[PDB]
Curated annotation (Swiss-Prot), chains A, B:
The chain holds residues 228 to 289 of 450 of the full protein. Autophosphorylated. This is Sensor histidine kinase EnvZ. Member of the two-component regulatory system EnvZ/OmpR involved in the regulation of osmoregulation (genes ompF and ompC). EnvZ functions as a membrane-associated protein kinase that phosphorylates OmpR in response to environmental signals. This two-component system plays a role in virulence. The modification Phosphohistidine is found at residue 65. It comes from the Bacteria. ATP binds at residue 65. Has several major domains; the N-terminal cytoplasmic domain is followed by 2 transmembrane helices that anchor the protein in the membrane; the periplasmic domain between the helices interacts with MrzA. The cytoplasmic C-terminal domain has a HAMP domain joined by a flexible linker to a histidine kinase domain. The HAMP domain by itself is intrinsically disordered. The cytoplasmic dimerization domain (CDD) forms an osmosensitive core and includes the autophosphorylated histidine residue. The lineage of its organism: Bacteria, Pseudomonadati, Pseudomonadota, Gammaproteobacteria, Enterobacterales.
Length: 111, 111
C-alpha cells in the first residue's frame, strides 16, 4: 500500500503545474527507481511551461521599448516643421497616435 | 515485469513532449486504475504546452499586420512635403525604415 501513495502524489503535482502553479516543486525527484524517473519527466514538463511563459512576457517589453525611440523622434521632427506644411505634419501626428493606442490596449489586456 | 513496461512508456512519452513533440500521444489514457490517472495528468501537461505555442504564433502575426497601415500613411505624406522642410522629412523616413528592420529581425529568428 505504501508504494500506492507516490503514484497519487505524482498525478496530483502534475495537476498543480497545469493549472498555473509553475513554482510548485515536483515530488520524488530524488528517487532512483522507475518512479523517480517519472518525477524527473514531470520536472521537464514544468521547465517547458515556465520557459514559454517567460518568453511571452519579455517579448511584450522588448517590442514596446525599441518602438519608443523612432516614435519620439518623429513627433519632435513634425513639431519643428513650419505652418506651411502643417497639414502634412497633422497626418503623421494621427499615425503616431494610433500606434501608441494599439500598444496600450495590448498591455492592459495582457496580465 | 509487465507492470514495469507502462511506467517506462509513460516517462518516454512525457520526454517526447518536453523536447518539442507537442503531437506525441499519451499512452494508457483509457485506463481507469492508478496508471490511467497518471496518463490523464500527462495529457493535461501536453495541452498546456500546445496552448502556449498557439498563443505565440497568433500574437506575432496580429501585431505586424496592423503596424503596416500607419507606416504606409507616413511614407506617402512625407513625400508630399515641400523642399523647404526636406531635412525634416528625411528624419521621419529614416525612422520608419528602422521600424521595418525590427519586425524583419523577429520573423527571421523564428520563421
Amino acid at each position: 500500500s505504501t508504494i500506492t501513495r507516490p503514484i497519487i502524489e505524482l498525478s496530483n503535482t502534475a495537476d498543480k503545474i497545469a493549472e498555473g502553479n509553475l513554482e510548485a516543486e515536483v515530488p520524488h525527484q530524488n528517487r532512483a527507481d522507475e518512479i523517480g524517473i517519472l518525477a524527473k519527466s514531470i520536472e521537464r514538463l514544468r521547465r517547458s511551461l515556465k520557459q514559454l511563459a517567460d518568453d511571452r512576457t519579455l517579448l511584450m517589453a522588448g517590442v514596446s521599448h525599441d518602438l519608443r525611440t523612432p516614435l519620439t523622434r518623429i513627433r519632435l521632427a513634425t513639431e519643428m516643421m513650419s505652418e506651411q506644411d502643417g497639414y502634412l505634419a497633422e497626418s503623421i501626428n494621427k499615425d503616431i497616435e494610433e500606434c501608441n493606442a494599439i500598444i496600450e490596449q495590448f498591455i492592459d489586456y495582457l496580465r
